[PDB]
Amino acid sequence: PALISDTDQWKALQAHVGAIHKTHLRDLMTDADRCKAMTAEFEGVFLDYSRQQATTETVDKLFKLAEAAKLKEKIDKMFKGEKINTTENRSVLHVALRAPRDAVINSDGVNVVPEVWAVKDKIKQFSETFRSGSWVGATGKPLTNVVSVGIGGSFLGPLFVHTALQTDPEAAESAKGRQLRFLANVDPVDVARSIKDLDPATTLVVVVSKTFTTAETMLNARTIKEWIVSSLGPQAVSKHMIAVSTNLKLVKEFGIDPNNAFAFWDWVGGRYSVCSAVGVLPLSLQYGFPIVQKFLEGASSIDNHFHTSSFEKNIPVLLGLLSVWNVSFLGYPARAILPYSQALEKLAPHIQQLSMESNGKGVSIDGVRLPYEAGEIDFGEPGTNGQHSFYQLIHQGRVIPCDFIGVIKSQQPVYLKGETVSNHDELMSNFFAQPDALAYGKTPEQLHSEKVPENLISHKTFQGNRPSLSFLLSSLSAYEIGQLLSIYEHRIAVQGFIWGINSFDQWGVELGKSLASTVRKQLHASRMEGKPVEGFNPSSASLLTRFLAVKPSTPYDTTVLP
Amino acid sequence: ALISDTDQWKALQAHVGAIHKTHLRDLMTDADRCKAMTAEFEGVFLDYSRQQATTETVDKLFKLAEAAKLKEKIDKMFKGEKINTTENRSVLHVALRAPRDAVINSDGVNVVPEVWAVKDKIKQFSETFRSGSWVGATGKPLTNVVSVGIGGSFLGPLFVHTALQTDPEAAESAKGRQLRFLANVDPVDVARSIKDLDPATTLVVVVSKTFTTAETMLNARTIKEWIVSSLGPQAVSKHMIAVSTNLKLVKEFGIDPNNAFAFWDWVGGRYSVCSAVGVLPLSLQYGFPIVQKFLEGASSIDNHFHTSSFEKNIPVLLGLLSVWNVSFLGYPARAILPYSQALEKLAPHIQQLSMESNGKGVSIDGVRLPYEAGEIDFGEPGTNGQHSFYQLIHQGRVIPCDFIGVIKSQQPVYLKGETVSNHDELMSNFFAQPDALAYGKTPEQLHSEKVPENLISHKTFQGNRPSLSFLLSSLSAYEIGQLLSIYEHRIAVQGFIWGINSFDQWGVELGKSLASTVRKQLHASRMEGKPVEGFNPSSASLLTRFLAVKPSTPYDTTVLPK
């Protein structure tokens, strides 16, 4: 009901900001009891948030806000299958995607778990048939390359897990000689990328779209379908294309065998769909189902930890509260996702959609316009890549709270005889230093003490007191990748739960889709019927005229592929 | 003085209230305003009519540029003055693409003949290399090239390389060849760079000015071990070259010193792709003529930026507009949104170019700024980013967007019977999204469409959110050079108005110092068994947990990935 910014716990945290402004992390980081209290741990995940602009009292006052906002109740209702997505009247049950085969999680009055595992066992049987070569192509060759066609949550989630599993030794062994590519952009350049160095006779296409009507995905689906027909004949569509969708009619009218359709559900948001057939099917073809099952079990272990653990030990709750503290009370509009792992190269782009599409909202869940701004701007590059890109601003420009992620055991250990440190040790040297560099800074007195010229000390001053948090993971196999994914999925839910918004709808995408259909009609009328440009403002009319002024080089209505 | 204390700054501050009394859905109906708020140079058309501004706002930003002596600073850069006052260095990335008979002095010596001496050396080497006469140890012609480097040695070339990969001309000249980048010190990146490569058909280019860069040289010694383990120690001079000015270490590394290619201290790292940093590897992949057209594209913008009046000056307009969005409208972030899959790696480069240049806290004289400068830059290509975070840009925090579209497609595709071509489907979003952000959708429109009253708040688009649109005629090497030079000069303009030094980077020093300290502690504990000493309680624990897992291979023994 009432806006969270109207409660006393919210106002109490606002007054608490003035006291924290009086503090500096250079002094706070010497307190052994403060540092030890501001940690959390679960299995192979160690969270150290001692470098936040906070004391234990700040965490205490954040817990009371979570109670006033009814955080625990909102969590339980999600797990129990209630339709907490109010604006769409949908359950929010991506946790059921990795629940064990015995659990009971109702939605619309029916337990969804036995049907979640029905698709898993169907994926497993297909993947075993596919990987053992019994699934053959039109020319009689076993398919070894898989293209997954999809946009948004059908792309970023799966791409993240695929990139992280690529260089893990056990996963990479199972994916020997197999490629998995993603065709996401409707830009025809992406189609040329997806099919480069590929043989239609040894390629399988997985079209991912709940509706099977998605404009971008279906145009690519029809495009690569013709690519298959152009080389193998019209009958090769059934043995070379499969679908992750529920519209069985369009799937068959597309030319795909309806039994080759793998279903997910409306209580599976796009940005929470990697654990569904959206991700499990392509990943089980590349790495096998045992590997993806370990990934699901990792995310499942965090779902239990998030649902049952007390708040002082609850890692996703701690993370979500500290982000609200940084965003809504310290005033930091952006957040940097900085994993020191090339395997996590595609983590930040997925967190980008997961966070901003969930929490980039302007009204509460009940439709009251928020007097404050919610979801932060999320970006990131892996260390040390991003370290040599934008850390200059993070140290001396605008303040950006940082998520540092480090892994103890290297996926691909390297050491050369005579080196001071192993390659992974050299990488982690920065993982340990940068958070301390942000917290302490370097005073002008330290600089003048080091005989630095007075005209340079202002330029070499580091103010410090800039917040960070550090994940230390035991390893990065399928299990730990699932844990990291679930941690962020729940953290974003916690932030949206505290802000009192709806983290699970996405109405902000419709207006751009509407106007795009209006432009598409204008393009068709001009290209095919020679109609003038009409119905647009003077700017759009001019830009459309410049675009359409370049006529095609291809004969009228004639197919062209790269 | 300080730009925030001038009347031109204060007059623009009050002007914000007048613009806040307008809405873009009304301003976009003015044909006079829309036509005046444009600019054009060759195949580059800039439409900024969707900025929260009028021609009067632009007139007042011009008077801020005059009070900031913008034209003075630009001339001093082009002329070769050491405007990088904190490092006492010229700023002459424009000289990398100047013609042979150009006159650009630093310390009274014309640097242009030395720029072309390297360029001529690159061309002669690239012809001998691509012709196959340059052979490996086993006598095989070299097919694949790995460029080792970090920061500006990585992002710039990656951007240009990714844009050229799918250009029809460039891709033809790069057939059968690979160009990979090894940037992360994470040994997972080493494993990926050498994945499915043969040392006998691989050339390595080490890009590091001093040849002392910690991450680059460890990767450089690592890939050197990979080569010598397969071909012998003698093969180094035949498979490895360098972009460096430290001739002693190049010869000590094993590389023939005459295979070292120079660049200079007045070339910023984030400004170095037009030097041998980029020109050398790109010429190996695409041939020198393709790269010279790229350089000629950047050169065309340099002349335009240096000579054109401010109302036709595309980089000056862009810099003043971003300063307007940042320092007066209060928008702390900027979205780079190219509707081109070929520009996939554009936003990561702009990220470093902008944030490392302008993420500053003090003026060029050493005065601490009472405002904040450099904005936070991020982006994904359309339509990828469209289906990721556009939810927030429409309904959450306001983020000024840069839209980049291309009239002609690098890879045109059309299927018979389709309503629009694949590229037209892409561009429909390019034209629609800026209008969607400008117009919004009022709750009166939604009620007029029989939307339930409870959902009206959630489907409302406030509109009046700013964007600008680039429309390029094509995306060949020439236009890629133009786009690069535009963003380099725009970033300089913003730093000139703010009165900061866009060309030093002291903010990266504290992290490298404390990383060296952690490197010492790691060696002392790995090789000498020393305890953890000299760190705060948090870093001590993190370090203790990390070192608790011991190397899994014999002492001081070489291990390579895969």
DSSP assignment string, B109-125: EE-HHHHHHHHHHHHHH
Give, to the nearest 10 degrees, the angle between helix B288-307 and helix B112-130: 150
Burial class (CB in 10 A: 0-12, 13-18, 19+), A475: middle
**CA neighbor of A94 nearest in space, from A79, A72, A84, A74:** A79
End-to-end CA distance of chain A: 56
Q: In whole angstroms, give the CA distance from residue B239 to residue B245.
A: 19
- Do A119 and A152 contact (CB within 8 A), yes or no? no
Interface test with B, best of A226, A388, A471, A558 (most B CBs within 10 A): A388
The helices-and-strands tally (H runs, E runs) of chain A is 23, 12
- Do B235 and B228 contact (CB within 8 A), yes or no? yes
- Do B315 and B65 contact (CB within 8 A), yes or no? no
Give, to the nearest 10 degrees, the angle between helix B346-358 and helix B477-498: 20
B535 interaction partners in chain A (CB closer than 8 Å): 436
Q: In whole angstroms, give the CA distance from residue B85 to residue B76.
A: 12
**CA neighbor of B130 nearest in space, from B289, B327, B359, B314:** B289
B212 CB neighbour count, 10 Å cutoff: 11
| A198 φ/ψ angles, rounded to the nearest 5 degrees | -115, 145
Kindly state the DSSP code that residue B530 receives in the 8-state scheme: P
Q: How far is CA B307 from CA A233, B92, B181, B267, B486, in A?
A: 59, 17, 37, 22, 14
Which of A176, A196, A417, A513 is an active site residue?
A513
A93 CB neighbour count, 10 Å cutoff: 27
Q: In what order do the strands lie in the sheet with B376-378?
A: B38-41, B44-47, B467-472, B401-406, B333-338, B376-378
Q: Tell me the three state secondary structure of residue A470.
A: strand
H or E segment and range at residue A547: helix A538-548
Flag whether A211 is marked binding.
yes
- Do B347 and B401 contact (CB within 8 A), yes or no? no
Q: In what order do the strands lie in the sheet with A45-48?
A: A39-42, A45-48, A468-473, A402-407, A334-339, A377-379
Task: Enter the tokens of residue B109.
Answer: 């010596």
Write down the residue that tokens 């057209």 correspond to.
B293
Q: In whole angstroms, give the CA distance from residue B331 to residue B323.
A: 10
Task: Enter the tokens of residue A502.
Answer: 């709806």
Task: Enter the tokens of residue A364.
Answer: 């509460």
Task: Enter the tokens of residue A23.
Answer: 């503090």
Q: In whole angstroms, give the CA distance from residue B403 to residue B338.
A: 6
A197 interaction partners in chain B (CB closer than 8 Å): none
Looking only at the bridges linking them, the beta strands covering B144-148 and A110-111 are unpaired
Q: Which residues make Cβ contacts (< 8 Å) with residue B394, sequence separation at least 6? A: A360, A508, A509, A511, A512, B436, B437, B461, B465
Question: Which amino acid is present at B29?
Answer: T
Q: What is chain B's length?
A: 562
Q: In whole angstroms, give the CA distance from residue A180 to residue A165.
A: 12
Give, to the nearest 10 degrees, the angle between helix B314-323 and helix B477-498: 50
- B376, A400: Cβ pair inside 8 Å? yes
Q: How far is CA B552 from CA A109, A384, B86, B555, in A?
A: 52, 24, 47, 9
Q: Tell me the three state secondary structure of residue A41.
A: strand
Q: In whole angstroms, give the CA distance from residue A476 to residue A474.
A: 7
- Do A333 and A376 contact (CB within 8 A), yes or no? yes
- Do A390 and B356 contact (CB within 8 A), yes or no? yes
Write down the residue that tokens 């393709």 correspond to.
B290
Q: In whole angstroms, give the CA distance from residue A355 to residue A359.
A: 6
A396/chain B closest Cα distance in angstroms? 5
- Do B153 and B349 contact (CB within 8 A), yes or no? no
Q: In whole angstroms, give the CA distance from residue A432 to residue A50.
A: 13
Question: Which amino acid is present at A74?
Answer: K
- Do A524 and B420 contact (CB within 8 A), yes or no? yes
Question: Which amino acid is present at B260?
Answer: A
Q: How far is CA B516 from CA A434, B178, B521, B526, in A?
A: 11, 34, 9, 15
Provide the strand spans (E) within B172-216. Answer: 178-182, 202-207
Interface test with A, best of B24, B459, B510 (most A CBs within 10 A): B510
Q: In whole angstroms, give the CA distance from residue A406 to residue B531.
A: 21
**3-state helix/strand/coil string of A337-406:** EEECCHHHCCHHHHHHHHHHHHHCCCECCCCCECCCCCCCEEECCCCCCHHHCCHHHHHHCCCCCEEEEE
State the Rg of chain A over Cα.
26
Kindly state the DSSP code that residue B90 receives in the 8-state scheme: -
Task: Enter the tokens of residue A424.
Answer: 């992974």
Residue A405's Cβ-side half-sphere holds a number of Cα atoms within 13 Å equal to 28
- Do B383 and B339 contact (CB within 8 A), yes or no? yes
Query: What residues are paired with A43 via a beta bridge?
Result: none
Instruction: Kindly provide the resolution of this structure in angstroms, with one decimal.
Output: 2.0
End-to-end CA distance of chain B: 58
Q: Which residues make Cβ contacts (< 8 Å) with residue A314, sequence separation at least 6? A: A40, A305, A306
Q: In whole angstroms, give the CA distance from residue A448 to residue A442.
A: 11
Residue A432's Cβ-side half-sphere holds a number of Cα atoms within 13 Å equal to 32
Write down the residue that tokens 């002596």 correspond to.
B69
- Shortest CA distance from A364: residue in chain B: B458
- Do B123 and B100 contact (CB within 8 A), yes or no? no
Burial class (CB in 10 A: 0-12, 13-18, 19+), B455: middle
Query: What residues are paired with A405 via a beta bridge?
Result: A339, A471
Provide the strand spans (E) within B23-128. Answer: 38-41, 44-47, 105-106, 109-110
Task: Enter the tokens of residue A350.
Answer: 């997925």
Q: Which residues make Cβ contacts (< 8 Å) with residue B443, sequence separation at least 6? A: B456, B457, B460
- Do B470 and A376 contact (CB within 8 A), yes or no? no
Q: Tell me the three state secondary structure of residue B44.
A: strand
Q: In whole angstroms, give the CA distance from residue A101 to residue A79.
A: 16
Q: Which residues make Cβ contacts (< 8 Å) with residue A539, sequence separation at least 6? A: B28, B34, B47, B49, B50
Q: Which residues make Cβ contacts (< 8 Å) with residue B279, sequence separation at least 6? A: B96, B119, B122, B288, B291, B295
- Do A418 and B556 contact (CB within 8 A), yes or no? yes
Q: Which residues make Cβ contacts (< 8 Å) with residue A160, sequence separation at least 6? A: A274, A344, A346, A347, A349, A350, A485
Q: What is chain A's length?
A: 562
Residue B312's Cβ-side half-sphere holds a number of Cα atoms within 13 Å equal to 10
**B512 catalytically annotated:** yes
Q: In whole angstroms, give the CA distance from residue A525 to residue A442.
A: 63
Kindly state the DSSP code that residue A89 receives in the 8-state scheme: T
Handedness of CA A389, A394, A395, A396 (dihedral sign): positive
Domain ranges of chain B: 1-92+293-508, 93-292, 509-562
User: After which residue numbers is chain B interrupted with C–N beyond 2.5 angstroms?
Assistant: none
Q: In whole angstroms, give the CA distance from residue B313 to residue B328.
A: 21
Query: What residues are paired with B443 via a beta bridge?
Result: none
Q: In whole angstroms, give the CA distance from residue B370 to residue B384.
A: 37
Interface test with A, best of B404, B458, B550 (most A CBs within 10 A): B458
Q: In whole angstroms, give the CA distance from residue A319 to residue A404.
A: 13
Which of B21, B175, B248, B512 is an active site residue?
B512
Q: Region of B482 please: left (phi>0), alpha (psi -120 to 50) or beta.
A: alpha
Q: In whole angstroms, give the CA distance from residue A529 to residue A444.
A: 70
Q: Tell me the three state secondary structure of residue A297.
A: helix
Q: In whole angstroms, give the CA distance from residue B498 to residue A318.
A: 38
**B356 catalytically annotated:** yes
Flag whether A388 is marked binding.
yes
Kindly state the DSSP code that residue A149 receives in the 8-state scheme: E
CA A82 to chain centroid: 24
Q: In whole angstroms, give the CA distance from residue B115 to residue B92.
A: 11
Q: Tell me the three state secondary structure of residue B146.
A: strand
Q: How far is CA B149 from CA B202, B273, B319, in A?
A: 17, 12, 29
| B527 φ/ψ angles, rounded to the nearest 5 degrees | -100, -25
Q: In whole angstroms, give the CA distance from residue B205 to residue B278.
A: 11
Kindly state the DSSP code that residue B201 receives in the 8-state scheme: G
H or E segment and range at residue B405: strand B401-406
Question: Which amino acid is present at A351?
Answer: I
CA B4 to chain centroid: 28
**CA neighbor of A468 nearest in space, from A428, A436, A430, A426:** A436
- Do A352 and B393 contact (CB within 8 A), yes or no? no
Q: In whole angstroms, give the CA distance from residue A448 to residue A453.
A: 7
**CA neighbor of A246 nearest in space, from A224, A268, A226:** A268
Q: In whole angstroms, give the CA distance from residue A403 to residue A392.
A: 16
- Shortest CA distance from A30: residue in chain B: B536
A423 interaction partners in chain B (CB closer than 8 Å): 185-187, 190, 218, 222
- Do B428 and B437 contact (CB within 8 A), yes or no? no
**CA neighbor of A49 nearest in space, from A483, A427, A475, A404:** A404
**B188-B192-B195-B201 Cα dihedral, nearest 10 degrees:** -110
Q: Which residues of B are annotated as a binding site?
A: 152-153, 208-210, 213, 356, 387, 512
State the Rg of chain B over Cα.
26
Q: Tell me the three state secondary structure of residue B280.
A: helix
User: Method used for this model?
Assistant: X-ray
Q: In whole angstroms, give the CA distance from residue B331 to residue B402.
A: 14
| A552 φ/ψ angles, rounded to the nearest 5 degrees | -65, 155
Q: In whole angstroms, give the CA distance from residue A462 to residue B363.
A: 15
**CA neighbor of A264 nearest in space, from A244, A234, A290:** A244
Provide the strand spans (E) within A69-175. Answer: 106-107, 110-111, 145-149
Per-residue burial over B57-75, b if 16 or more Cβ lie within 10 Å, else e, is: bbebbbebbebbebbebbe
**B387 catalytically annotated:** yes
- Do B148 and B223 contact (CB within 8 A), yes or no? yes
Q: In whole angstroms, give the CA distance from residue A343 to residue A159.
A: 11
Task: Enter the tokens of residue B477.
Answer: 């090497």
Q: Which residues make Cβ contacts (< 8 Å) with residue A230, sequence separation at least 6? A: A561
Q: Which residues make Cβ contacts (< 8 Å) with residue A16, sequence separation at least 6? A: A57, A58, A61, A329
Handedness of CA A266, A271, A275, A279 (dihedral sign): positive
Query: What residues are paired with B205 via a beta bridge?
Result: B147, B241
A304/chain B closest Cα distance in angstroms? 25
Task: Enter the tokens of residue A64.
Answer: 């009371």
- Shortest CA distance from B383: residue in chain A: A185
**CA neighbor of B106 nearest in space, from B80, B132, B87:** B80
- Do B383 and A189 contact (CB within 8 A), yes or no? no
B165/chain A closest Cα distance in angstroms? 9
- Do A291 and A171 contact (CB within 8 A), yes or no? yes
Query: What residues are paired with A345 via a beta bridge?
Result: none
Task: Enter the tokens of residue B507.
Answer: 């903010």
Query: What residues are paired with A206 via a beta bridge?
Result: A148, A242
Q: In whole angstroms, give the CA distance from residue B261 to residue B256.
A: 11
Question: Which amino acid is present at B335?
Answer: A
